[PDB]
Design a binder for this molecule. Structure first.
Ligand code: NAG
Lengths: 50, 171, 198, 137, 50, 39
């Protein structure tokens, strides 16, 4: 999977075989690093009105 | 009846669910409307058999058992008013007989108990005295009514008759 | 289950947002629901067609959402005007519009806030337990009719009194509780009696 | 029934208040070992007021009820970025979209109209008092 | 060809459903008015002119 | 909330709403209706 975000060390506990994490609206929010198995979050980088 | 068409349509998402939910919201709001308009009385009152109403004649609006237990003007009104592709037409929750029962209840309550039946328990009170109170509410002392009871009776009866004619004649 | 109205507003808006978001994951007749994916796989000539399809689809979904919101906001503005009227006529004063401020005679009301909405406490007055008195529209004393000033003529079968309409509190029929008019001839159902005089 | 084909419910001759509406006057309910029954709902206990021409009924006591009434006043103020919604960060898409004109901008204007109408609603409902009174101790 | 027919019929259906939504809002307005008029004008005597 | 789906905050916060309603209630209790016609 691809996409833009701000990867940060999380505290979620995946299962040994799972790879993604999704929200109630089915959007990717956490990814397991396929080299070193540390689970990162994904926060869409800030936008907003002026 | 086209599997290819359905499988193509599936690519557009939840449009069916959306439209169905909207039309179901409307279809329930209708019965909520009718419920709120008519079902305002707690019980189902009933007029006494005798008709001593100081000289007024309500036979043109009270029900008669000789039918659809509707009344005369309700009849005139119901007479003056005159599929293959999922187009279903649901039936209304309250059938016309139950609507007629609601309106007969409100009418008998208004005749026999004044306004009090809308504030709590219905308390009977002679109709002449009820019209005395109604008068005294608009700044005209009671003795005007008590002295002109028969003339007022005749005027009210004639007006009801004119209503019957107007409805029965023009639509 | 009393707060169904507010809970319903919240649920309706949540479902609208969730449907809007989940429309992003639809193909609308294109290759893949992801843009970058087609941008890599296809060259500009065909990326143009795939994009144009995705744009048409997402734009239609967005317009549908905005129309839903417009209608629901009109309805909420109707209910807000109603709440403003009810607070101005029912708190800041005492009203005489039946059932506009709760079943019964209206005494006052108190407002209370609540998340996205207001909650009134209609203090009302309800008559409780009655008695079957015998009445009469007027009384004859000296051939002249006597009508009650503000009240009604009741009788427990033995005597006669004048009492206020909403609370049985009998009083002797003086020449002050009543006012005279006409004679005994014209009124219907009058009854002979003696109006005391102070 | 006059509504359709009901499957799995006994048909009673009675009449009670409507618990689950069906249509055409039929209402079903879970009652007594128990099961699901389908009756023709009743509208209330009939009552004949003892009317006469010289009998009046007067109350003697009273009760001070306290009823409740709940009203919604405002939605949630939502805003939708046109570009970042349809094709967030895809120049080809932005340049294609520019051909459709001001449709998105129009939608943005609509949603801001709503978002302001909300605060007008709450302002009008609550802010009716000029000062801030305080109860005595 | 199908895709064209589907687009057309779907757009027509959405137009119909929007018409129905607006007309139902109007009828609910008139129904609230009728409820108010019955509660204030039958169950009691009113003093609101006309 | 991730795709321009911003949720603005309401101008009047719940504390100020509560203050408004406490004002109306104290007014009605201590002064009747007159506080809606003037002083
Ligand atoms: C009330 O009706 C009875 C029934 O016969 C009658 O005798 C009586 O005179 C009536 N009273 C009045 C005041 O009309």
């Amino acid at each position: 999977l691809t996409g833009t975000g701000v990867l940060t060390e999380s505290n979620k506990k995946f299962l040994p075989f799972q790879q993604f994490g999704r929200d109630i609206a089915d959007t990717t929010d956490a990814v397991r690093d396929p080299q070193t198995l540390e689970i990162l979050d994904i926060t869409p980088c800030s936008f907003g009105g002026v | 009846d086209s599997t290819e068409c359905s499988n193509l349509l599936l690519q557009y998402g939840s449009f069916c669910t959306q439209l169905n939910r909207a039309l179901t919201g409307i279809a329930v709001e209708q019965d909520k409307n009718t419920q709120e308009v008519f079902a305002q009385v707690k019980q189902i009152y009933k007029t006494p058999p005798i008709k001593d109403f100081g000289g007024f004649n309500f036979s043109q609006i009270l029900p008669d058992p000789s039918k659809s237990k509707r009344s005369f003007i309700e009849d005139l009104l119901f007479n003056k008013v005159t599929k293959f592709n999922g187009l279903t037409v649901l039936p209304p929750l309250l059938t016309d007989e139950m609507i007629a029962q609601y309106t007969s209840a409100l009418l008998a309550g208004t005749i026999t108990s004044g306004w009090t039946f809308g504030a709590g328990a219905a308390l009977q009170i002679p109709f002449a005295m009820q019209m005395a109170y109604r008068f005294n509410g608009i700044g005209v002392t009671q003795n005007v009514l008590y002295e002109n009871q028969k003339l007022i009776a005749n005027q009210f009866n004639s007006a009801i008759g004119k209503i019957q004619d107007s409805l029965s004649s023009t639509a | 289950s009393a707060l169904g109205k507010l809970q319903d507003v919240v649920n309706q808006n949540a479902q609208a947002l969730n449907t809007l978001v989940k429309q992003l994951s639809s193909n609308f007749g294109a290759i893949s629901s992801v843009l970058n994916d087609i941008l890599s796989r296809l060259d500009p000539p065909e990326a143009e067609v795939q994009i144009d399809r995705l744009i048409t689809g997402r734009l239609q979904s967005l317009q549908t959402y905005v129309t839903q919101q417009l209608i629901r906001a009109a309805e909420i503005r109707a209910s807000a005007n109603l709440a403003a009227t009810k607070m101005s006529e029912c708190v800041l004063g005492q009203s005489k519009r039946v059932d506009f401020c709760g079943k019964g005679y209206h005494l006052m009301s108190f407002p209370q806030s609540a998340p996205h909405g207001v909650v009134f406490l209609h203090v009302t007055y309800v008559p409780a337990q009655e008695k079957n008195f015998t009445t009469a529209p007027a009384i004859c004393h000296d051939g002249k009719a006597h009508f009650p000033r503000e009240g009604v003529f009741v009788s427990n079968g033995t005597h006669w009194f004048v009492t206020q309409r909403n609370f049985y509190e009998p009083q002797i029929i003086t020449t002050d509780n009543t006012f005279v008019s006409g004679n005994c001839d014209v009124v219907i159902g009058i009854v002979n009696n003696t109006v005391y005089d102070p | 029934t006059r509504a359709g084909c009901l499957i799995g419910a006994e048909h009673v001759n009675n009449s009670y208040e409507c618990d689950i509406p069906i249509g055409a006057g039929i209402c079903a309910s879970y009652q007594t070992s128990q099961s699901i029954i389908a009756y023709t709902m009743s509208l209330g206990a009939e009552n004949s007021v003892a009317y006469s021409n010289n009998s009046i009924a007067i109350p003697t006591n009273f009760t001070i009820s306290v009823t409740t009434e709940i009203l919604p006043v405002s939605m949630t103020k939502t805003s939708v970025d046109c570009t970042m919604y349809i094709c967030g960060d895809s120049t080809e898409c932005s340049n294609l979209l520019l051909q459709y004109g001001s449709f998105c901008t129009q939608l943005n204007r609509a949603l801001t109209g709503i978002a302001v109408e909300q605060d007008k609603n709450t302002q009008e409902v609550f802010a009716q008092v000029k000062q801030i009174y305080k109860t005595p101790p």
